[PDB]
Amino acid sequence: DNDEKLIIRCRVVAEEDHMLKKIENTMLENITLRGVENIERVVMMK
Amino acid sequence: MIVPVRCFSCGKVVGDKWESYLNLLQEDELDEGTALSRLGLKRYCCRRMILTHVDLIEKFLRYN
Amino acid sequence: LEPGHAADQEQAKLIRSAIEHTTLKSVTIASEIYYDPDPRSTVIPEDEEIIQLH
Amino acid sequence: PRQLHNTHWGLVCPAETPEGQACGLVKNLSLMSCISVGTDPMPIITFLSEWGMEPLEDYVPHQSPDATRVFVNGVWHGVHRNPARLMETLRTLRRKGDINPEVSMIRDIREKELKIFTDAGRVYRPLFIVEDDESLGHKELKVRKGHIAKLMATEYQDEYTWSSLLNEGLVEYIDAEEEESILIAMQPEDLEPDVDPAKRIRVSHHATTFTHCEIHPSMILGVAASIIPFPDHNQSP
Amino acid sequence: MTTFRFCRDCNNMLYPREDKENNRLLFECRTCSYVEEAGSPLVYRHELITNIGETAGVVQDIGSDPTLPRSDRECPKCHSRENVFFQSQQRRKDTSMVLFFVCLSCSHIFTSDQKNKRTQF
Amino acid sequence: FEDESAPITAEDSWAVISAFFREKGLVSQQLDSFNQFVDYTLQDIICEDSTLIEISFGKIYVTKPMVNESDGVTHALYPQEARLRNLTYSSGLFVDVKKRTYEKVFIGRLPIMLRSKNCYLSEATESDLYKLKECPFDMGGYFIINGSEKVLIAQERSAGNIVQVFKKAAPSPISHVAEIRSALEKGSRFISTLQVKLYGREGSSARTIKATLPYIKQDIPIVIIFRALGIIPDGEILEHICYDVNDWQMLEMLKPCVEDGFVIQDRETALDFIGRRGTALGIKKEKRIQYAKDILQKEFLPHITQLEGFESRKAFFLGYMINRLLLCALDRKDQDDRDHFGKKRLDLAGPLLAQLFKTLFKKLTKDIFRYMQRTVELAINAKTITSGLKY
């Protein structure tokens, strides 16, 4: 976290850049980080 | 169609002034409002009578 | 918010972030695929440090 | 389709529409709109390649990347490398009659496109043309007082006409599409460079590049709304 | 920032291949028996947050476009005060409303973006 | 003496506007469109399908207006009388026919618009109008059919020939499409739709593109369409689409397109894959191939050319459209505004009655080839045209 740049670096574990680029889309879209499905914005109000 | 005989609102005869109104303008060169006041039509109700008549008959009589 | 904690601006932040849906995608600036064949060192200046932790 | 859209400015009336189900879909042409009747493209086409248009078969995008794509009724006929030459001549030629006045030409300077249209059913209107220069310093409308008097002598003899106005490059007809490539002044005084507390506020000419001026704003209306007095003092409905 | 290669002989695109022994990157073709070595190890990029295209349109003739607003800003290059200016031409919901100015003597492009991270445009 | 060079002022606009209206009056939209019909569209309707299988029509004259009588017969008809007798202010049509061997002439009544060039009242003066019992103020631009005065209302439609792109909502498997309605001033008005589709939503898996051609019952990968036209190598194909070699963005977008069409590497093949999607099992290859060639020469982007040498022009235009779509996908341009009036056309009298009188002159010319397919060996139904008009 100190590191000044955030970087994630991924490899698989024979035809290997397809699985990469689907893998990538799973990454980017079907990973829930924090939060509850379906709740797209939340706003505070007083 | 034709000058109306009286002011709608006051009764003043106004049917006997159209000839003259128009001679006052074309023959003695008066502007429409000094003309109308010459004819004695000094309330706005009768003014409007002269001032806004439209002599449509003139165009009706062109048909045979 | 829970009865004690309802006029902490900072406890309703936390609550908003425990709820609001968050994917890798909202945080990700770019992705890339490189040929970097030797898993013990690297074509990438910048991840020398990263790698150098294993 | 029911809403008034910015692009009906000046071609359809912003007021006259029937209530109900037609609302919006029944329109009436502005007092001065017209609609093209179509005219054949083939001199334009031919002129274009006299003026340096390159044909699609020779086009090599990789070797002419800066080029302007030229379309005529919706066909890509090729590319050109000085469209600004081309366009200054085209317009000259339509402002003297040699390309018909109801033809439309647009150049889109950043899109690197020049689109011309010569088909029927486009609706249009006239505007003044505004030119730098003169000599006399600023951008001025091309008509001037003498043109007007020739107009009015003609009126009073009841020969200078409408068309004399188009032929001389003083007025030109503009359709919605070419309206997007211009900038129009609302009153001729926005060209020259203590107020009556009772007059309406207007916010000035922050404009040195007009290419045209409206003839009169009150032409945006149609037949009916041209009969209401002071419709600029009424709620819209 | 991938840059895209084609067969010398066929003009078809090339695809990456690992040289399994010597641990290197090749581009081969699928039609020919053409191969060549790779120029970089980058084979693919995906910008979720992108600027390509902010400055789409800046053309030699930008200054004859009468629609464009103009300002008396000065350039960083020419010390000129003849610009035309526009907003991002990306067309995002998620764009900033920053200004890009085009110097009409020297053709240099410059922003009003106080948080300028950009070298080029 | 006041400078002739002087700049005008706001008052002076009304002069110009009076001048506009003295010349044009208030319904030129009506008149100018009828007159161009009369003068130019008519005749052009006869010299598209002029000949059959021999017989070819030539020149047209149009009569002044007149009536087929009850008894004492055929007579100049003024608009006043057509109104009062429930008549139909019409004139008639005359071609110039030719018999020529290979194994004047009335043809009907055209309702004429008042104040057009062909109606008596355009030339008339004031006086003449009063004698005729026509008010000097009437302006024309309507017809009289069966005595009732009848106006055509302009109709609004989209223009043709225009490329529009569109995003498509959420449960759809296409995400953008691009679409043109291709069509003609000369030929007919045959209206093919090309659509160009980008498959898969924002990060589906290989987003591809493919195009829907007419009579072809599968969508065809766009690279296969470019090879069927003749542009074979990835390299040249992408070049008609992405006119900037440093847009790595777009070209990365075109990769799955290139894998989609990697099975077909020359134009015969390409023909054939398309040909097969248009013919039945059985049909032989060279007949397939030519199916595909004919679809593409005749029914794919026909506003460009419908004749033989014209492939670099369609390839480019297909390319451009794909460029359009991508630019929208990549979020550099907005989806097209379907409410831009500049993109609309309004159809009046002219073109409405040419929908019509072309449609029926093409019944009337097909009734001629049945004086002829059934002749084992100047005999024409006139009315069909007269009453299709008036009806």
Add this chain to the structure above:
Amino acid sequence: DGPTMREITETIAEAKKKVLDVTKEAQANLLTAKHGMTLRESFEDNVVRFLNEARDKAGRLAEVNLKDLNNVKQMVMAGSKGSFINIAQMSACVGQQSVEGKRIAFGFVDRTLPHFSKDDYSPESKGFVENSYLRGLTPQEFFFHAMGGREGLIDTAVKTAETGYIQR
């Protein structure tokens, strides 16, 4: 009153300056969004607050200045007819116009009408009407109020028909 209209005119002037700084502020990228709301949305929400808070202050201004004998006021007073917004629009300023909840939108490319230059987000460009009905509208104003107007006239036929079917 002449004094009141000078105060109305400034009231209005002040709001146009506040939008101008918001503008420049966004144009230097120093504006912040707050949380999920875009930048641009943030900007709009702000200039429309500003312009309507103008409209309103300008009208309260008028309302105060007019006298007890003011017959419009006498009607509102009694209840019989007219409200604030009426006084306001007639006498001080008609206000921001809008179509689907937003400022007049760029129907031509990057602009609301060809009498403006591109990228113009100012009041006048996207639909504020400064004037009152007494004073009358400008051409531009005129057209954007009718855009607005129109939206109601459709929204009211759709209302009335949606409404009758529910009722039954």
